[PDB]
Symmetry: none
Subunit: 146 residues, 4 copies
């Protein structure tokens, strides 16, 4: 529903698949997509692995997406998230905490195929939504003439 959304690495990959190509088209009509540089880096890693020109692929990425650098404000947030998770006896991935920190920072709804690993970070102001539910919401909006 909100104007600002983001995706984590796997949801980004799904959103790029030929079968999402229509959902993507509507997504970019309707939402501002604020990707973490971590998500971009993880994505560019697998592209480069497939021997793609990642300098060119990044140019295409920044044409349709906002790419959010990892700065000092996000690092503060991520440290505080991680330390709290660690106090509660949990072992968060670095990629997750940094992706959540960036989403909290840009005030973006995080679209993910694995919502639950971000659940311990809800308490910090992260909104999340399952990819399959997000896909259903986008089609509904077209039906509702939004």
């Amino acid at each position: 529903l909100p104007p600002d959304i983001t995706f984590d690495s796997l949801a980004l990959i799904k959103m790029h698949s030929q079968s999402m190509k229509k959902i993507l088209e509507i997504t970019l009509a309707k939402f501002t997509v604020n990707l973490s540089i971590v998500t971009v880096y993880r994505y560019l890693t697998v592209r480069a692995y497939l021997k793609k020109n990642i300098e060119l692929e990044l140019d295409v990425l920044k044409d349709i997406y906002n790419i959010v650098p990892l700065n000092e404000e996000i690092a503060i947030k991520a440290a505080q998230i991680e330390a709290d998770l660690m106090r509660k006896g949990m072992m968060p991935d670095i990629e997750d905490v940094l992706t959540a920190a960036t989403a909290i920072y840009t005030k973006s709804l995080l679209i993910t195929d694995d919502s639950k690993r971000y659940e311990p970070m809800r308490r910090f102001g992260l909104d999340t939504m399952p990819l399959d539910k997000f896909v259903k919401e986008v089609e509904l909006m077209v039906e509702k003439e939004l």
Copy 2:
């Protein structure tokens, strides 16, 4: 005329900021340009927030004594290339290592660490390392000689 460029990983940075390393830190700041990845900064402030310190306060001191290098598009490309090429060879490196290494190659910083063997697969990419113990002995030596 320019002071050599160096960096630290987060384990080494934590030790550089210990009570016992105050003078070494002070000499290090006077004699070198220290280019810290924002990711090393984040991992360091994680330790500090776990100890319930004032991370905003301490980050402002860090901001002042360190060149803090954000993770931007250019370092991400470099890190993506590094990591893809390591994978093309059977290896699955840690995110912290790759982004740390990639930032040190991009800033041309000697990476100072207690775990130099962990960083060996990235030598080919132009990473230079030096063990913390050896770096500390060398800083001590420069002070001895000048004084």
Copy 3:
């Protein structure tokens, strides 16, 4: 500010002038300089015209610079770039195409006094920076330090 840079032949000429002696010295400690063998040959032409000792000078360039041969991989990129330019009605100079292709292949920022000359090649991934701006940035690091 990136770690890998290069110069065209006219920029290299200036970099080795008397005025630029300290800048040159700072560049070599702060950066990796990846020079196309084409740039090197055009530089050596000027030097040979001034009745200098070009074999001796070359032996010094070899130790301070990464001199990049015109190999198969570069020849293919140069060819793709030039054909694409010709398809748009442009006739680029051989030295520009080969310089630009080598810099794309090496991922080096091309420092030059004639950035407009090279602008048709940015779409292929070429990064440039004016020599004046580069010099001033080097001088700034020195001023701040001293």
Copy 4:
């Protein structure tokens, strides 16, 4: 006569044409052809302009020709050739200098459809022969 030969860019194009298939056949059996990477890049350029896959095309050239990178030794000789030619009130093409410099180095008879523009470079050890005369002496 010599086992070592090379072509410049136009000559290579004409050697690759339909009419020259037999001459090319006898050329590849009789001679070692030492092609400058510069000749190759120029050839690949006109193929890419016709939207050919030059990776595929480079692989064919790789198998039939000795492709000669532009290295430090060639660069010195080209610099010397060029500076000298300039002091004598000329401005040679860069492609021509690099092509001549590579032929001197590989001690290759340069086969060209334009021998005259290479004439200033004879004094540096370059051997040239017209393609027309070459074709005659092949058949």
